[PDB]
Design an enzyme around this catalytic site. Structure first.
Site, short mmCIF file in Angstrom:
data_model
loop_
_atom_site.label_atom_id
_atom_site.label_comp_id
_atom_site.label_asym_id
_atom_site.label_seq_id
_atom_site.Cartn_x
_atom_site.Cartn_y
_atom_site.Cartn_z
N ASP A 43 -46.26 -19.58 38.26
CA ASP A 43 -47.15 -20.20 39.23
C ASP A 43 -46.35 -20.93 40.30
OD1 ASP A 43 -46.13 -22.34 37.79
OD2 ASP A 43 -48.02 -22.82 36.79
N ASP A 45 -45.80 -24.71 41.71
CA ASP A 45 -46.00 -26.12 41.43
C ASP A 45 -45.91 -26.92 42.72
OD1 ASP A 45 -46.14 -26.01 38.43
OD2 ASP A 45 -44.12 -25.17 38.73
N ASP A 85 -50.39 -25.28 40.51
CA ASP A 85 -50.39 -26.44 39.63
C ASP A 85 -50.03 -27.68 40.44
OD1 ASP A 85 -48.81 -28.39 37.77
OD2 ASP A 85 -50.01 -27.16 36.41
N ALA A 99 -46.13 -40.32 39.13
CA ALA A 99 -46.32 -41.23 38.01
C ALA A 99 -45.55 -40.71 36.79
CB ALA A 99 -47.79 -41.38 37.68
N1 LIG Z 1 -45.49 -36.61 35.63
C1 LIG Z 1 -46.08 -36.87 34.31
C2 LIG Z 1 -46.44 -35.61 33.55
O1 LIG Z 1 -45.23 -34.85 33.41
C3 LIG Z 1 -45.37 -33.61 32.72
O2 LIG Z 1 -46.25 -32.76 33.40
C4 LIG Z 1 -45.70 -31.64 34.12
C5 LIG Z 1 -46.48 -30.41 33.68
O3 LIG Z 1 -46.16 -30.08 32.33
C6 LIG Z 1 -46.12 -29.24 34.59
O4 LIG Z 1 -46.89 -28.10 34.19
C7 LIG Z 1 -46.22 -27.11 33.44
O5 LIG Z 1 -46.60 -27.19 32.08
C8 LIG Z 1 -48.00 -26.93 31.87
C9 LIG Z 1 -48.27 -27.21 30.41
O6 LIG Z 1 -48.05 -28.57 30.10
C10 LIG Z 1 -48.31 -25.50 32.30
O7 LIG Z 1 -49.68 -25.22 32.03
C11 LIG Z 1 -48.02 -25.39 33.80
N2 LIG Z 1 -48.30 -24.03 34.29
C12 LIG Z 1 -46.55 -25.74 34.02
O8 LIG Z 1 -46.26 -25.73 35.42
C13 LIG Z 1 -46.47 -29.57 36.04
N3 LIG Z 1 -46.24 -28.41 36.92
C14 LIG Z 1 -45.64 -30.77 36.49
C15 LIG Z 1 -45.92 -31.98 35.59
N4 LIG Z 1 -45.07 -33.11 36.00
C16 LIG Z 1 -45.91 -33.84 31.31
N5 LIG Z 1 -46.09 -32.59 30.57
C17 LIG Z 1 -47.21 -34.63 31.41
C18 LIG Z 1 -47.04 -35.92 32.19
O9 LIG Z 1 -48.31 -36.56 32.33
N1 LIG Z 2 -45.84 -25.46 27.78
C1 LIG Z 2 -45.23 -26.42 28.49
N2 LIG Z 2 -45.35 -27.70 28.08
C2 LIG Z 2 -44.74 -28.65 28.78
N3 LIG Z 2 -43.97 -28.54 29.88
C3 LIG Z 2 -43.87 -27.26 30.25
C4 LIG Z 2 -44.45 -26.16 29.63
N4 LIG Z 2 -44.13 -24.99 30.30
C5 LIG Z 2 -43.37 -25.40 31.29
N5 LIG Z 2 -43.17 -26.75 31.33
C6 LIG Z 2 -42.38 -27.53 32.30
O1 LIG Z 2 -42.93 -27.34 33.59
C7 LIG Z 2 -41.90 -26.87 34.50
C8 LIG Z 2 -42.52 -25.96 35.53
O2 LIG Z 2 -43.02 -24.77 34.94
P1 LIG Z 2 -43.38 -23.50 35.83
O3 LIG Z 2 -44.66 -23.88 36.54
O4 LIG Z 2 -43.70 -22.38 34.85
O5 LIG Z 2 -42.25 -23.29 36.80
C9 LIG Z 2 -40.87 -26.22 33.59
O6 LIG Z 2 -39.60 -26.16 34.20
C10 LIG Z 2 -40.91 -27.10 32.35
O7 LIG Z 2 -40.12 -28.26 32.53
#
Ligand SMILES: NC[C@H]1O[C@H](O[C@H]2[C@H](O)[C@@H](O[C@H]3O[C@H](CO)[C@@H](O)[C@H](N)[C@H]3O)[C@H](N)C[C@@H]2N)[C@H](N)C[C@@H]1O
Ligand SMILES: Nc1ncnc2c1ncn2[C@@H]1O[C@H](COP(=O)(O)O)[C@@H](O)[C@H]1O
Length: 175
Positions: A43, A45, A85, A99
Site C-alpha cells: 500500500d 502510507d 494507510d 503521536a
Molecule cells: N504512531 C503510533 C502507531 O504506530 C504503529 O502504527 C503504524 C501502523 O502499524 C502502520 O500500518 C502497517 O501495519 C498495519 C497493521 O498494524 C497494516 O494493516 C498496514 N497496511 C501497514 O501499513 C501504519 N502505516 C503506520 C503506523 N505508524 C503501531 N502499530 C500502532 C501505533 O498506534
Molecule cells: N502486521 C503488522 N503489524 C504491525 N506493524 C506492521 C505490520 N505490517 C507492517 N507493519 C509496519 O508498517 C510498516 C509499513 O508497512 P507497509 O505499509 O506494508 O509498507 C512496516 O515497515 C512495518 O514497520
C-alpha cells in the site's frame, strides 16, 4: 506497482496545489530515502496534518477514490484498487509529529526521491520505530521477506547503535 508510483505523484501534486504537506511513510519512505525502488509495497502510507484531514479526503475523492474505515491510528482510503494507510501528525513546536513516534518523524525538508521527484518522507527513526511494534505482535521469524529486508535496510541506513538506543526508548516507554 507502476500504478502506485504514479498514484504517489498524483497525490503529492494535488497536495502541493493545496499547500498541504504530506509525508510518504513505511516501505515507500525507505525506497524514497534510498532513491531506488527495492520491493513491492502492499500500500501507500501517508502522514498528514491531523487538523487538515478534510483536505486529504478531498484529494482522495478528487482522484476518484473514497474514504473507508477508521483505523486504530488513523484512517484507510482507496483509489482504484490501491489502499492508502493514513496517519495524522500534529504540530509540536517547529514541526509536525506523529503521536507515539520518535522526535523528528515529519521533517520539513523533502529528503527522498521517487521516480526522480523529491518527496517528503518520514525519518529513518520513525520508519524503524514501527518495526518495533511489529516485532511485539508477530515473531520476526514469521515476517515476510519484504518486511525483513526492508527492516535491515533501515537498520543499515540509521546505524546499529542508534537503532538500539531507539529500541531502548521504545521498550522503556511501553513497559
Ligand atoms: N504512531 C503510533 C502507531 O504506530 C504503529 O502504527 C503504524 C501502523 O502499524 C502502520 O500500518 C502497517 O501495519 C498495519 C497493521 O498494524 C497494516 O494493516 C498496514 N497496511 C501497514 O501499513 C501504519 N502505516 C503506520 C503506523 N505508524 C503501531 N502499530 C500502532 C501505533 O498506534
Ligand atoms: N502486521 C503488522 N503489524 C504491525 N506493524 C506492521 C505490520 N505490517 C507492517 N507493519 C509496519 O508498517 C510498516 C509499513 O508497512 P507497509 O505499509 O506494508 O509498507 C512496516 O515497515 C512495518 O514497520
Amino acid at each position: 506497482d507502476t500504478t502506485q508510483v504514479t498514484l504517489i505523484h498524483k497525490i503529492l501534486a494535488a497536495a502541493d496545489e493545496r499547500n498541504l504537506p504530506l509525508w510518504i511513510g513505511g516501505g515507500w519512505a525507505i525506497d524514497a530515502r534510498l532513491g531506488r525502488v527495492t520491493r513491492k509495497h502492499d500500500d501507500i502510507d501517508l502522514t498528514f496534518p491531523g487538523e487538515r484531514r478534510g483536505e486529504l479526503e478531498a484529494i482522495v475523492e478528487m482522484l476518484g477514490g473514497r474514504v473507508m474505515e477508521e483505523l486504530d491510528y488513523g484512517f484507510l482510503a482507496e483509489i482504484g484498487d490501491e489502499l492508502l494507510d493514513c496517519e495524522p501528525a500534529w504540530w509540536a513546536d517547529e514541526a509536525y509529529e506523529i503521536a507515539e513516534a520518535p522526535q523528528g518523524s515529519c521533517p520539513e525538508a523533502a529528503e527522498g526521491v521517487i521516480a526522480g521527484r523529491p518527496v517528503r518522507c518520514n525519518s529513518w527513526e520513525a520508519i524503524i520505530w514501527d518495526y518495533f511494534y511489529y516485532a511485539d505482535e508477530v515473531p520476526p521469524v514469521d515476517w515476510p521477506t519484504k518486511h525483513i529486508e526492508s527492516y535491515r535496510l533501515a537498520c543499515t541506513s540509521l546505524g546499529a547503535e542508534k537503532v538500539e538506543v531507539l529500541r531502548a526508548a521504545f521498550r522503556s516507554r511501553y513497559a
